[PDB]
Amino acid sequence: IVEGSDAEIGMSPWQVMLFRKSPQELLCGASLISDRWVLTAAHCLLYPPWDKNFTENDLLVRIGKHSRTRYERNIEKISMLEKIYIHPRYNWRENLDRDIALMKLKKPVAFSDYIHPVCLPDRETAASLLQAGYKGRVTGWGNLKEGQPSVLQVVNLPIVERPVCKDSTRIRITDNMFCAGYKPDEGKRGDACEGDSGGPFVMKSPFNNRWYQMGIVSWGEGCDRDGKYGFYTHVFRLKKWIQKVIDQF
């Protein structure tokens, strides 16, 4: 996260860290959507242009964390993966279209003050909140500049009009994406960056005071460049695939 702030304890109890076994390192963010399921970006697991192709046994998820590097004894839970699901039509060749994956934990994790699942949006929630100018919140332990924070970082960013998102890049944008960030004249900054991938973009519903995950940190050109924007996987547009995977498996 670039130009963010230190999160508060308990601020994002759905935040998940994907952690590589060996070497031991930070892969990505992710989010807890139930006792048994974790949502993240497909490009965190699979991206052949960088020879990235992780499987169940290469990774651990770490839930309940604040510090990037400490083992937060008595606080964090570390879980192993039973299975990974990547969207069948994930387009890693071109524009990261459908950048989404589900992960099934080996055993359910116990909820606590620091661990708690975020809601998935329904059609009406999405229609109401997913609007240019409305702000969401992005969290992660990723790079501070295009060096690495000691604790979880947070930043709030406005959703940007689709035509402006299109006009900022050569990349083909699709309906499964939205972009977010301040424009160059708005005089505020911030973006996700490397190591933030797969993290949740969340909004708080004014109607029921609940937190909803609207996006997944997907891609960008650099981090926090003027005239560029962060792109996010559009969670509700892919929700059918999500429901399909879950109650089938």
């Binding site: 651990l60 590097t69 083992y71 570390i78």
Partner: peptide
């Protein structure tokens, strides 16, 4: 850079 986690988890 990262503190070692309990050995069992790396199992």
């Amino acid at each position: 850079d990262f503190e070692e986690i309990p050995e069992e988890y790396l199992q």
